[PDB]
């Protein structure tokens, strides 16, 4: 009611008017007036304990492994930056596109090739979070990227 | 077979016309004409027109015979009101409502 555009004059006297008491028209009881406990800008972030996010990263990966949905791959054969190249690779690897895949690789060309597929979430290893692992049905990682995951949970 | 006319936005208060419309509901077109002619009300003028217009529609568009027409249904609905200021003593303003009528008349054929 203080940030609203109207004036602070009392619209009519306190007594003897036959109408209710009012101050300015910016009061939240008027139409067009102030809002009582409406949203103001907020920072929603909070510092989650480090070991909890470290443990969560492990446990996320562990869950996929426990159900046999983690695949380590040593290299991406014909994948040189084209989607048709990644599909053909994915075919030979059992990634037939009937399952959401989180692809974790440092190789820029491979993430280029894979980005646009509705069933593939592209990710660098420095980026591995649990939400993306859990969003997806099966996990696929470089040996290079599995090295980073193993490092960040040590 | 029926024929109708609707006079919309007639600038007369609904309550005042209904009295004139109540006289003709169910009458033959000939009796209703006579009644309206010698009714001493402003609304009589407006009701007559709607009556004669619906009668014209009956004869012209709906293959009904004038010599058999009667008022099968008639009613006055209220339309949007004209709001006007009436100035009173001691600096007070009142709001006269200049009300408004949608007049409707439906004729049928009374075979015999």
């Amino acid at each position: 009611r203080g940030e609203v555009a109207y004036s602070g004059r009392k619209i009519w006297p306190q007594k003897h008017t036959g109408r209710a008491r009012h101050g300015d028209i910016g009061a939240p009881i008027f139409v067009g007036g102030g809002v009582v406990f409406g949203p103001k800008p907020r920072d929603y972030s909070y510092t989650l304990p480090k070991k909890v996010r470290k443990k969560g990263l492990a446990m996320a990966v562990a869950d996929r492994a426990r159900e046999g949905k983690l695949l380590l791959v040593e290299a991406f054969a014909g994948v040189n930056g084209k989607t048709k190249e990644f599909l053909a690779w994915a075919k030979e690897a059992g990634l037939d596109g009937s399952e959401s895949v989180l692809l974790v690789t440092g190789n820029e060309l491979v993430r280029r090739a894979a980005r646009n597929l509705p069933w593939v979430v592209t990710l660098a290893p420095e980026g591995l979070n649990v939400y993306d692992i859990v969003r997806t049905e099966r996990l696929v990682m470089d040996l290079d990227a599995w090295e980073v995951f193993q490092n960040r949970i040590g | 077979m029926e024929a109708k006319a609707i006079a919309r936005y007639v600038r007369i208060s609904p309550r005042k016309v209904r009295l004139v419309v109540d006289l003709i509901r169910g009458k033959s077109l000939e009796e209703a004409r006579n009644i309206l002619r010698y009714t001493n009300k402003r609304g009589a003028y407006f009701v007559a027109k709607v009556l004669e217009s619906a009668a014209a529609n009956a004869v012209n568009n709906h293959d009904m015979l004038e010599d058999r027409l009667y008022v099968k249904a008639a009613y006055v609905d209220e339309g949007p009101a004209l709001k006007r200021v009436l100035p009173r003593a001691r600096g007070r303003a009142d709001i006269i409502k200049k009300r408004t009528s949608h007049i409707t008349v439906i004729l049928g054929e009374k075979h015999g």
Binding site: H16, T17, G18 | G91, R92, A93
Partner: peptide, 14 residues
Amino acid sequence: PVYIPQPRPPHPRL
């Protein structure tokens, strides 16, 4: 409306 006519004084119940 903008202007309130003042009300009559009360009967003096004194």
